[PDB]
Amino acid sequence: SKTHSFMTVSLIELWERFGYYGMQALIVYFMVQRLGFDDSRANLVWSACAALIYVSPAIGGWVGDKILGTKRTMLLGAGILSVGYALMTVPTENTWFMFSALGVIVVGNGLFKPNAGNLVRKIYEGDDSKIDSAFTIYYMAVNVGSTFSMLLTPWIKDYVNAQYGNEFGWHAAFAVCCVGILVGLGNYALMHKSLANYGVNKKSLAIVLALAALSVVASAIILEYEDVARVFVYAAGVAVLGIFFHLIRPSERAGLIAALILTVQTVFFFIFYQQMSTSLALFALRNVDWDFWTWSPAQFQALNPIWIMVLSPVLAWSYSWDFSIAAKFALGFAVVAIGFFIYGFAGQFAVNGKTSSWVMIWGYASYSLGELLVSGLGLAMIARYGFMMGAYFVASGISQYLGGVVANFASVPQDLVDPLQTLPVYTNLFNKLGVAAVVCTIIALAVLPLMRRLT
Numbered sequence: 089s090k091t092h093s094f095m096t097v098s099l100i101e102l103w104e105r106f107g108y109y110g111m112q113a114l115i116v117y118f119m120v121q122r123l124g125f126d127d128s129r130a131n132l133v134w135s136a137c138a139a140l141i142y143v144s145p146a147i148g149g150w151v152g153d154k155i156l157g158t159k160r161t162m163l164l165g166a167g168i169l170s171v172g173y174a175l176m177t178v179p180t181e182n183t184w185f186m187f188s189a190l191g192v193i194v195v196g197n198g199l200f201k202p203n204a205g206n207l208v209r210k211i212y213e214g215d216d217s218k219i220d221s222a223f224t225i226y227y228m229a230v231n232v233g234s235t236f237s238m239l240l241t242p243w244i245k246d247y248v249n250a251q252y253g254n255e256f257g258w259h260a261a262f263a264v265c266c267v268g269i270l271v272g273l274g275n276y277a278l279m280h281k282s283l284a285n286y287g288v289n290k291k292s293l294a295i296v297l298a299l300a301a302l303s304v305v306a307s308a309i310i311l312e313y314e315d316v317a318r319v320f321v322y323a324a325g326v327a328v329l330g331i332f333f334h335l336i337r338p339s340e341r342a343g344l345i346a347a348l349i350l351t352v353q354t355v356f357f358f359i360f361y362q363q364m365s366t367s368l369a370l371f372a373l374r375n376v377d378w379d380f381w382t383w384s385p386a387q388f389q390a391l392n393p394i395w396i397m398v399l400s401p402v403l404a405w406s407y408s409w410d411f412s413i414a415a416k417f418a419l420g421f422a423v424v425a426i427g428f429f430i431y432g433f434a435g436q437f438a439v440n441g442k443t444s445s446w447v448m449i450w451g452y453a454s455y456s457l458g459e460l461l462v463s464g465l466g467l468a469m470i471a472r473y474g475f476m477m478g479a480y481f482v483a484s485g486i487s488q489y490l491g492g493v494v495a496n497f498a499s500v501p502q503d504l505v506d507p508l509q510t511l512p513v514y515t516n517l518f519n520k521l522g523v524a525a526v527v528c529t530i531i532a533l534a535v536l537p538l539m540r541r542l543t
């Protein structure tokens with residue numbers, strides 16, 4: 089009976105991320121192509137949205153576990169997400185229409201993501217090794233879903249734009265997101281009834297919905313106003329750095345210092361990882377050309393889940409059987425390093441103004457493999473000496489915005505359309521970032537003896 093209970097929760101996650109990534113691939117292009125955003129702001133706005141999205145399940149996790157139901161909060165978040173993309177199907181209107189929609193997605197995410205995952209931790213089966221195996225199948229469930237989205241939505245965006253100019257076009261794609269949610273939540277979520285935590289308090293339901301609407305407003309204001317989010321992130325940074333400042337204040341130092349390095353490396357990693365949704369997505373837009381009527385530049389992001397699915401069974405194959413396998417951080421950075429250098433040396437070979445189509449295929453292959461290697465991100469993994477549920481998680485949220493400030497180094501002015509000139513600024517970033525990625529590789533191994541010391 090464990091199988092059925094896991095199958096449903098996995099299918100809802102599949103369609104949820106279908107809608108989510110189906111939106112992610114296109115949103116930054118939407119701000120640039122349909123709306124008139126410059127890559128500078130487009131990167132910042134999307135990256136602040138990502139920061140909020142990452143940091144969202146913090147509040148909502150506690151909501152489903154202590155305030156309302158786990159299954160109920162999950163279902164609620166899914167409906168909120170549904171109305172989130174529902175808001176994305178209306179034309180242009182005030183710019184504030186989108187920011188609000190994003191804010192709704194923020195809130196929806198926070199109520200779905202942690203609880204849907206909590207169910208997998210609970211049912212099938214609960215306090216067993218099976219959990220780790222389960223979360224991998226669940227991990228794959230995301231990748232299969234986000235595949236069909238990141239391939240269909242830009243294709244539907246392109247196709248509908250050809251039949252009817254501007255509207256729906258992009259909004260047709262956002263409607264695809266919407267109906268995806270209405271497919272997962274609309275079917276699978278009510279097909280089975282599994283046991284959760286609370287199982288509804290109307291006073292608590294109300295106070296939650298009110299605060300959720302308010303959070304949509306507050307998110308919209310941080311997204312629209314560039315400087316506001318900048319201050320919000322800065323404040324969050326002084327916060328995280330302060331917590332670590334109090335934690336370190338002889339024997340505990342061996343773990344804490346290591347954790348401090350780990351968290352910053354995690355921060356570093358998220359920076360690299362955001363590039364593909366930002367700067368690398370923009371680089372790919374200034375090269376729609378594809379060899380391998382199709383194929384759209386946003387479709388390049390789909391390489392990520394596709395590569396993960398094909399490299400996963402390769403990595404699971406192990407001849408081993410030990411301890412301090414934190415060297416996988418270094419390898420990861422190292423593999424990310426050459427990935428960026430692929431884009432770095434893209435300007436040299438295969439260029440007709442600005443070409444290199446396969447450069448994205450092999451590049452993303454390297455990104456996905458590096459992401460695959462740093463799977464043990466766990467906040468408890470760094471906690472060897474317990475304020476990591478905050479400081480670390482928040483730091484990992486802050487980093488998402490930092491990825492946009494780093495993407496901004498490759499921001500092409502709106503008046504610059506000549507691909508022969510856009511190419512170098514992108515490669516110069518990618519060539520720099522690869523080098524920076526080697527620096528972390530060194531960092532990861534320099535901190536290795538500190539992991540050897542505590543054990």
Ligand SMILES: C[C@H](N)C(=O)N[C@@H](C)P(=O)(O)O
Pocket residue numbers: 105227230231234392393396
């Ligand atoms: C599909 C994508 N590569 C992925 O696995 N994402 C998970 C880490 P998330 O959907 O929880 O961010």
Ligand SMILES: [Zn+2]
Pocket residue numbers: 432519523
């Ligand atoms: Zn170089």
